């Protein structure tokens, strides 16, 4: 399973089971460019969020109701949607994944 494999290898579920996590299959340069695209408010009300002009290939990884450490279980949902990321620093780079529309 891509999600079980990737989450593990990325040290994401090595010491616990992360309930949800999205993976972006676009280049890093192209994802970093979103920080200068459409400004929107994060779900929390913050406004340092940016929505990508176009849709991007992403894979949603969600734990199943049965999942329990050490045996984490994820459902793999591949899709193409706009991504919304929060940006900070200098340069202005993504630091959080807010959502995918």
């Amino acid at each position: 399973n891509y999600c079980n494999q990737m989450m593990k290898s990325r040290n994401l579920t090595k010491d616990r089971c992360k309930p949800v996590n999205t993976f972006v299959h676009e280049s890093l340069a192209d994802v970093q460019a979103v920080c200068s695209q459409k400004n929107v408010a994060c779900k929390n009300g913050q406004t340092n969020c940016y929505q990508s002009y176009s849709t991007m290939s992403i894979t949603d990884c969600r734990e199943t109701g049965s999942s329990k450490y050490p045996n984490c279980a994820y459902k793999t949902t591949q899709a193409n949607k706009h991504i919304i990321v929060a940006c900070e620093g200098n340069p202005y780079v993504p630091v959080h994944f807010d959502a995918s529309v």
Binding site: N11, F23, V24, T59, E88, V95, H96
Partner: peptide, 15 residues
């Protein structure tokens, strides 16, 4: 060691 931008890359990037 790991910064917020670095953490985002490791957790969400898979070009």
């Amino acid at each position: 060691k790991e910064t917020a931008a670095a953490k985002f890359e490791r957790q969400h990037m898979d070009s």
